[PDB]
């Protein structure tokens, strides 16, 4: 009896495998990308900073913020799928020229564009990242892609 | 006899894949409800981002196995609200006035067990209107079924 | 044992809640750009792109370009094409030898619902398919841009 139930119980986690394997292929298409836990989406949009920071937060999770050579291409992926560059989560609003993570870890990892970056104006203190995916600073106010990481 | 040490080895595995199920769907809820979903309670709203007439809304939903958005809360209006807010678009709920004049009900003709009209409203303007549209501000309005609002529905 | 069977049922509770909300969450990821038809998923990425482009997508996403094996599946995919009023591309091809058109994996068709007239190489020069808003067939030269529809 106790078999029979427990192989009941197998033949529904099976199912539930390949059903959710299936439904993640779904979902990531075609605004998503997955790289190592990580799951970066895009909403498709275009917003400024502050906007589409709190957009990500009220989703659950946060702006992009590739820490690895693999994270970036990822979202360089979806970049590049949109033909618009993105914001990132890190500024260096608190301290000029000193770029950090929402929760004030400075950077683990960056890809910045060659002379970046520049405070441009005296009034650079977000990042984009463009479909090359390398990095630039730029004015928080401006508007760009929103890609949010889970 | 001792064939309980296989089975047992089969449930612990199934432990760990259940775990696994249940983490990495934690996960995508978040993902796939962004930037059109909404979760509210054990309810979800998800927009469709264009706007259509009730007829036409009130068949996507239903076709997609849901219905039109219909809150019966407070908690669930404002759920919606938020999604009537980012894309700045006036939605259709679910029930309509069709049936019996000033008597609003679910597709399922069942009264409302909650409302959120704005100051004088429902009001059937030119004596036709018998749906329904929720503002960026939260707030009902009846209106003409004919119009286009966004569509949103619930599942 | 006792131990175990408690364990199973309350483990069990536990896989039928996900059952249910991972149906939940299903419906909501099909509404409005995607459609199930038996194991099958449609999913219409809402833009246009020429054949090679649309195929390296759904290829790159785990799948592949629409291919309706049976009048249910082209229905439902049909679906998807009304929604958008955009005729989309689908996965075969006779790029091969041309007047057989195939699936990726080189299988010929086992299902067609070419409109009147078609596929007739119009130019000499039409290697792929395309499904119009009233579920018909058409072969259509692969340069040419059309709604992007996979199947997973
Ligand atoms: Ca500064
Ligand atoms: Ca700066
Ligand atoms: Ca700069
Ligand atoms: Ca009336
Ligand atoms: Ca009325
Ligand atoms: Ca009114
Ligand atoms: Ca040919
Ligand atoms: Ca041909
Ligand atoms: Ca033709």
Not at 5 to 31: C, D, I, M, R, T
Not at 91 to 117: C, H, I, M, Q, R
Request: charged share 20%.
């Amino acid at each position: 009896s106790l078999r029979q139930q427990v192989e009941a119980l197998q033949g529904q986690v099976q199912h539930l495998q390949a059903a959710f394997s299936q439904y993640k292929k779904v979902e990531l298409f075609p605004n998503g990308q997955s790289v190592g836990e990580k799951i970066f989406k895009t909403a498709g949009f275009v917003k400024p900073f502050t906007e589409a920071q709190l957009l990500c937060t009220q989703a659950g999770g946060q702006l992009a913020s590739p820490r690895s050579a693999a994270e970036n291409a990822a979202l360089q992926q979806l970049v590049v799928a949109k033909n618009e560059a993105a914001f990132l989560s890190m500024t260096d609003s608190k301290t000029e020229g000193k770029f950090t993570y929402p929760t004030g870890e400075s950077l683990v990892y960056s890809n910045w564009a060659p002379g970046e970056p520049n405070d441009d104006g005296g009034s650079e203190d977000c990042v984009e990242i463009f479909t090359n995916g390398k990095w630039n600073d730029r004015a928080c106010g401006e508007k760009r892609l929103v890609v949010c990481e889970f």
